[PDB]
Amino acid sequence: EEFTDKVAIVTGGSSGIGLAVVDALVRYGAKVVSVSLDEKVNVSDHFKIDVTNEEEVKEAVEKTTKKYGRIDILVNNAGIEQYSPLHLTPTEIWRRIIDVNVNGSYLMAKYTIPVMLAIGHGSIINIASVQSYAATKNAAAYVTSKHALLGLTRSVAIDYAPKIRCNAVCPGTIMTPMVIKAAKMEVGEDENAVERKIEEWGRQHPMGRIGRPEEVAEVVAFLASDRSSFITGACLTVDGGLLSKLPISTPNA
Amino acid sequence: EEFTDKVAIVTGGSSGIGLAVVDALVRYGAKVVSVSLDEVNVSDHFKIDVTNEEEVKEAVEKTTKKYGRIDILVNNAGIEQYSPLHLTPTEIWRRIIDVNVNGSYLMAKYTIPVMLAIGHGSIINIASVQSYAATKNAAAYVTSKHALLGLTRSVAIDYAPKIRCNAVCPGTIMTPMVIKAAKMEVGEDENAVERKIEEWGRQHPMGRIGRPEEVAEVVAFLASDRSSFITGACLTVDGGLLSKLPISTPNA
Amino acid sequence: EEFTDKVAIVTGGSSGIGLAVVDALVRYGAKVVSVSLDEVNVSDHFKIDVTNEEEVKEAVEKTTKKYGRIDILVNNAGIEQYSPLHLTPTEIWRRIIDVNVNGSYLMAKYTIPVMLAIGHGSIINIASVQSYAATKNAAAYVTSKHALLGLTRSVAIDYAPKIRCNAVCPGTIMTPMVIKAAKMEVGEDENAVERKIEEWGRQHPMGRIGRPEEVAEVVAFLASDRSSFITGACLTVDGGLLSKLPISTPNA
Amino acid sequence: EEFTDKVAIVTGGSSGIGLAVVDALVRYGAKVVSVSLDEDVNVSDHFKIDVTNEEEVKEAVEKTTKKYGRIDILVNNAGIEQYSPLHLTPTEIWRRIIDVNVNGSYLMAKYTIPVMLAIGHGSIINIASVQSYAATKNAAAYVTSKHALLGLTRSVAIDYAPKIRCNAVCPGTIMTPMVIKAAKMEVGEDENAVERKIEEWGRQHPMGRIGRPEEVAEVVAFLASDRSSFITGACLTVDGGLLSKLPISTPNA
């Protein structure tokens, strides 16, 4: 319990990832304030707001600071997806993904940084993706917004060291309801096709499975912790080896 | 003669880099359609804001109507504000992302189906060494240049083999943007400006700063069939800056 | 209490970094087998050369006959000489590649099948920020730390899920190698040295160089079940060094 | 034209890639010296030497300079492969691959560099691999040596700028007689199995085909040319998009 007296804010807090991050941070002693589009745990407070709405972000951050007196940790985890290549992505959907996934993070960080400066220490963990380094097909706005998020990461880390560390977590496929929905979109519903498809994505990760939301949450907690006190501006992949794998088969002398 | 009968669109075509690119391409025989905020040796100029969907659509349809092809798109429109993230005003943050990322989305959006319909294209995003690492007080800029690499990788992967999409990541290049950055740091004092530039030059292994035409040659190579198995790549044109660790060493 | 009953081997075990990894793993309850040329309450010590296959084979087989397991291997034996490439004597170049790269091949070669037979392992290679970017006059060292990333990635990919393999890439850390490096540039002069250290620290966004324990926490995290979906990764522990572009920018 | 009166040394000169580099540099005007273990008269001189034998390297560089007065361009392209994971790679095989692939390049560079500093300019091109960034299974010594080559590349670039530029070319699968051998090793010879397998590898690259040796040579020639006068210490992929591709299927929305 090393996060005792520390306050954490976590966005997309009713996500698979978000919920696991909330649970991991409460388990290590923090008070967690959760932010999401729903009313949807062990959070000390929940804010139902749109991270792209500046007045809403500002009010939430100020109510938190007023009530708890401090914010030590921000986890930017809010993010949406459109499965379209670029030229097939309508303008409002493009702008909206870049707005949610990039500007939402900027806005949270913008209002949260002053308090962390005031207080002397802070830790900002940006939940990005393996799509921050490489691209799947049909993910133009998503891949671009996750690349952005590392730039956002490296900038904050450079401008605010040593008081604030800022790092990115880059997950491969993580078991969440989104993953189920995507399988269902791709293959439909003949006998166990949905499950076989989730198992197949697992088989492309060198680990031969997909990740659990708590395995992401453990990495977030470590970055939030004094344990990682010389890591900042880093982009840690949690992807079961995916990004280091070349998918060219090879004989076996 | 290499680009004879090929049509290239380049945005930010009054730029240090845009202008040099426009010229290499003209020199190598391309018909160049220049795009910028201003009013040059090109075949067509559109004075338009790349963030204006209507103006982009119109410039791309006119070009297509007139030449019946677009072989090459160079996305080079870019703005730079100087602020750390929490001191960046929201409207300024939103505008930089809009210009540097959405303007590229928009040019590509109308250009890609033309290239697919016709057989072949080459798209080049002018990104930056700041697509890999940050300077101080450049939050929106750094974010948007990292974003461009993603747009690049995405386009490459969805549109191979017909469309090749690559990024050129320059270091400090001698351009009006760079001269201006120096005065904002050092005053309009002619003499201090050159001292500032030469200091940036000495941060680069090459010991000088780049010329816009050295960037334009790399854009030319990427637009060319010579780079026909290159796509989704980020080519640094940085005199070695990114491979340099700035910690001194005994020379012994 | 997390590593109770687990067996760790750490090479370069009286290194600054080596020593802190040793204490950290001991303090989280591991049985630690130290490897070095030297002589900390480890459970065993081997005074061997990692480039000597016989000695490596001996240390690894005694260990597994003794404990019936090797859960954790930390490759950290690492030498350095200063010389640019063409001025590096052949024997010294070969020696640095041998220790830094083959020493790791050898330890892993004997440890892997043990981990595979028993069910599980974590291997952590201590590489460097010089696995990504170069300093001057460090040809052999820079090439050898890049090689270790390839060694890491290969091992990760051939042996998942049962073995996780990852690299830690430290920035400037307060160790004996680093104090020596400073003396080699600056002299024995006591606070000339610490001026040089301060100058390095100032190159890192954090404003100071790392402590060996900051490295060992990262190694502990990677040896641990907490990082169970992490493999083939490079974790920089560099106070932001690699994410920083060393080019000044205007204020406000 | 551009290389008229220039001299280039290319190692592994009777390989598919080496052969196409030699032809490309001759087309652009160079006098080209080949180095290989073997016995192509595009070349104006050929040295049947082992790049790991310092005295041979020294003698060949020395004979080249006395003949031509100059070496403008060095292409390190000597490489051997073994298809084994680390723990199945015997010690002599491991040391020999690191030796040829890393030590061979060090040696050539070691003797060419003072020639290049004397004449005042040089361009060094290291033929590395997509295996310089990520890994196939069963390729431990090879992946290690190709990562090493990038560090060799960055060091030379850092220490010898502005007079000597040093860059790396990172090919994906290139049609070579080695690719035929690897396919043969992997599937054997039932009907067109071997050709299908080379075709399957092509399908893994976003380009949907493998590369031609000449497409690698074009990039080497650009890197040797003054056209790339501000590129140094860069590692340029020629891989049909392979390294930018995530192999996780997605739906189309």
- D148–C153 CB contact, under 8 Å: no
Token digits for C95?
């020696």
Q: Tell whether domain A1-253 is in CATH 3.40.50.1110.
A: no
Q: Up-side HSE of residue C25: CA atoms within 13 Å toward CB?
A: 36
CA distance B81 to B180: 12
Question: Which residues 6+ apart lie within 8 Å of D183 measured at CB?
Answer: D194, D197, D198, D201
Q: Exposed, middle or buried by CB within 10 Å (0-12, 13-18, 19+), for B140?
A: buried
CA distance C224 to C13: 19
- D247–A248 CB contact, under 8 Å: no
- B139–A155 CB contact, under 8 Å: yes
The structure tokens 């080019």 sit at C247
Neighbours of B189 (CB within 10 A): 12
- C142–D152 CB contact, under 8 Å: yes
Token digits for D216?
């690698």
Q: Chain C partners of B184 at a C-beta cutoff of 8 Å?
A: 250
Cα nearest neighbour of C151 on chain A: A244
Calculate how close chain D gets to B53, using CA atoms only, in Å: 23
Cα nearest neighbour of D156 on chain C: C85
Q: Does the CB of D105 have a partner CB in chain C at under 8 Å?
A: no
B173 DSSP assignment:
B
Beta bridge partners of B75: B125
* Resolved by: X-ray
CB distance A175 to B170 below 8 Å = no
SS3 (DSSP) at C124: strand
Bond preceding residue B161 cis, omega within 30 of 0: yes
Resolution (A): 2.3
Q: Does the CB of B129 have a partner CB in chain A at under 8 Å?
A: no
Q: Does the CB of A114 have a partner CB in chain B at under 8 Å?
A: yes
Q: Exposed, middle or buried by CB within 10 Å (0-12, 13-18, 19+), for B118?
A: middle
What's the alpha-carbon Rg for chain A, to the nearest Å? 18
* CB-closest option in B157, B204, B206 to D245: B157
Bond preceding residue D251 cis, omega within 30 of 0: no
The fold of C1-252 is Rossmann fold (3.40.50)
**Chain C interface test: which of A230, A243, A246, A249 (most C C-beta within 10 Å):** A230
Residues in chain A: 253
Nearest alpha carbon to residue B145 among A157, A125, C132, A149: A149
SS3 (DSSP) at D73: strand
DSSP annotation string for B195-234: HHHHHHHHHSTTSSPBPHHHHHHHHHHHHSGGGTT--S-E
- Give the neighbor-by-neighbor strand order of the sheet with B31-36: B44-47, B31-36, B7-11, B72-75, B121-126, B163-170, B234-237
Token digits for B138?
């450049």
Return the partners of chain C (3 or more C-beta pairs < 8 Å): A, B, D
DSSP annotation string for B77-133: --------GGGS-HHHHHHHHIIIIIHHHHHHHHHHHHHHHHT-EEEEEE--GGGTS
Nearest alpha carbon to residue A51 among A76, A71, A72: A76
Q: Chain B partners of D230 at a C-beta cutoff of 8 Å?
A: 171, 206, 210-211, 214-215, 218, 237-239
CB distance D145 to D212 below 8 Å = no
CA distance D133 to D156: 19
Bond preceding residue D162 cis, omega within 30 of 0: yes
**A142 noted as active-site residue:** yes
CA C111 to chain centre: 17
CB distance B206 to B93 below 8 Å = no
Q: Does the CB of D243 have a partner CB in chain A at under 8 Å?
A: yes
**CA–CA distance from D117 to each of B241, C21, D51, D61, D112 (Å)?**
21, 44, 21, 14, 9
CA distance A110 to A219: 23
- B248–C136 CB contact, under 8 Å: yes
* CB-closest option in B134, B137, B154 to A140: B154
Q: Chain B partners of C134 at a C-beta cutoff of 8 Å?
A: 243-245
Q: Which of A:141-200 have CB within 8 Å of D?
A: 172-173, 182, 185-186, 200
Calculate how close chain B gets to C157, using CA atoms only, in Å: 23
Question: Which residues 6+ apart lie within 8 Å of A244 measured at CB?
Answer: A206, C153, C156, C157, C231, C232, C233, D134, D135
CB distance C235 to C220 below 8 Å = no
Q: Chain A partners of D182 at a C-beta cutoff of 8 Å?
A: 250-251
The one-letter amino acid code at B137 reads N
Q: Exposed, middle or buried by CB within 10 Å (0-12, 13-18, 19+), for D120?
A: exposed
